[PDB]
Automatic annotation (TrEMBL), chains A, B:
Broad class of enzyme this protein falls into: lyase
This protein's UniProt keywords: Lyase, Magnesium, Metal-binding
Cofactor(s) annotated in UniProt: Mg(2+)
Top-rank lineage group of the source organism: Eukaryota
Pfam families: Terpene_syn_C_2 (PF19086)
Protein name as catalogued: Terpene synthase
Gene Ontology biological process terms, A to Z: isoprenoid biosynthetic process
InterPro entries: Isoprenoid_synthase_dom_sf (IPR008949), Terpene_cyclase-like_2 (IPR034686)
GO molecular function: metal ion binding; terpene synthase activity
Record family assignment: Belongs to the terpene synthase family.
SUPFAM superfamilies reported in the protein's UniProt record: Terpenoid synthases (SSF48576)
Its EC number(s): 4.2.3.-
Length: 314, 314
């Protein structure tokens, strides 16, 4: 099997924040203070290695900025664990309380996950400053993310094979790209009208697809090993186009090439909103660029470790 | 080799204007009047079958509307023939004169190709009415089309294998999609500002890629049955991604799927410009839809007739 590099045409290159190993400890301290880690649960947690992910995607900056980058990825883990054996309606209330903790960090929390959420976002606004419009964008993205996951666990145990179109509509919210992008953009004070511009949304959608499909390609070998390969884009493509695994990977390479080319073209054709926000929007998608590359780096290294492997029998 | 259907997700369906056979004569009794056909030259002209293209592609309407639709396709051929043995700077002058013939149908012409151009456009404006903004769009599309072909024939006899990105930048002008779209849109009186809207340009680019890649895929067997065709998108993909023919076709299927999905998404997210313009833009891309399907229909039937079984081991 030949596995194409879906990001060969993605200009942003992999860079590890050097300040890791200097926040990796106090970051792992913080999380354990909120999660009663069982043995075997601490394993797969640290075998995922969410702090490295923060170092690959977050701004290259102060030790405090790498701090909040580590908390985001760790908070995503903690939120999923805290709501693991919760029902749909309970999960929706928990997510709504988490979003209230983000909106008002001055108000006190009422449980482990609202306190975690309150601390992490209070730290973030200390480091990054006030950003009314950015904060609203992030909470809106966090809401669409939590909804998609809670309501996909409500769909689970069903015999329908998802089409390629329906795979993307769901995975654009489930993969957690959108709230990662809007979080790393906090402080840029981008106006609400720019976030609602179709070319902003279009570039956001293209970058999310790349996070979803790279994650599925890099995890597919693992997934198909133990019948976890049912919700993968490769399975959707093989089923819908009646082609073998090799075919579906060439297909993704084509799909990826068009997606990247439209991301870059849309960047070059954005409207101007004057010099100040233009620099902000320039910086925003620079951060998205680093984020897509950083997810692909981490998602390749962790879900099939080895070295520079390119051909397997699976 | 398995050949995918690149337009399987394209909602517009193939429909032949029933008024063909009733316009095919008097329309073919026009090109003969302007081109001195030699044997072997009148062959491929009736073996290309440009009036069926007009019937597959143009609006389903009056016999006069099918007339102007067949004139455009016929004019594209007659222009290439008239400028076949011309130099680069000579070809630019002839193209500039033709565009002047479109701008001023009242003024007399000075040669075969300016008279044909004048007679075709006066008829077109008799049928569809005046369209100042639409006429400017079409002439701009026709300028970029003639320029691209004149400069490709001038660069030719060079050692460069063109990359995938450079293949698309050229072929978006060379395939004649853009002037076809703006021509079939004549009469809709779309505002100059809607033509310059990046979502209008993006949808236009997406539909042109589909015209370029369907034509190459449907002509690739012919093109390689006679060499290796170094100017085909399949050649560019095999070279650039170091994959075989089968691989490059799966790649195209993925590239087409993303392109189509972005065309439909972009249509659904156009801004509103009021009730009159919105109906105009709805009709414009409905016609582009029919045009893309119609080109794919014609170029599958012409370049390798046979039938649709799926497989063709060549």
């Amino acid at each position: 099997i030949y596995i194409p590099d879906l990001l060969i045409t993605w200009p942003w290159q992999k860079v590890r924040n050097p300040l890791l190993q200097e926040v990796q400890d106090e970051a792992n301290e913080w999380v354990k203070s909120f999660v009663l880690f069982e043995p075997e649960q601490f394993e797969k947690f640290k075998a995922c290695d969410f702090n490295l992910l923060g170092a690959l995607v977050g701004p290259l900056g102060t030790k405090e900025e790498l701090r909040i980058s580590c908390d985001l990825m760790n908070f995503y883990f903690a939120f999923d664990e805290y709501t693991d054996l919760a029902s749909a309606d309970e999960a929706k209330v928990i997510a709504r309380d988490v979003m209230e903790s983000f909106r008002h960090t001055d108000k006190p929390s009422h449980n482990k996950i609202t306190e975690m959420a309150r601390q992490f976002f209070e730290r973030t606004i200390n480091t990054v400053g006030n950003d009314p419009t950015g904060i609203e964008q992030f909470i809106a993205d966090f809401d669409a993310y939590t909804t998609s996951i809670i309501q996909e666990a409500d769909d689970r145990a069903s015999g329908h094979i998802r089409s390629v179109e329906d795979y993307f509509i769901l995975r654009r919210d489930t993969c957690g790209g959108k709230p990662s992008f809007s979080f790393f953009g906090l402080g840029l004070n981008i106006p609400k009208e720019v976030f609602a511009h179709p070319m902003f949304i279009s570039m956001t959608e293209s970058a999310t697809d790349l996070i979803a499909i790279t994650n599925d390609m890099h995890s597919y070998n693992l997934e198909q090993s133990r019948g976890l390969d049912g919700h993968n884009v490769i399975t959707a493509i093989m089923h819908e186009y009646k082609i073998n695994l090799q075919g579906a990977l060439y297909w993704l390479s084509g799909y990826a090439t068009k997606t990247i080319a439209k991301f870059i073209s849309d960047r070059k054709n954005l409207p101007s909103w004057g010099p100040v926000v233009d620099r902000a929007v320039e910086q925003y998608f620079d951060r998205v660029g680093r984020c897509v590359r950083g997810y692909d780096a981490w998602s390749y290294e962790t879900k099939r470790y080895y070295g520079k492997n390119g051909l397997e029998i699976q």
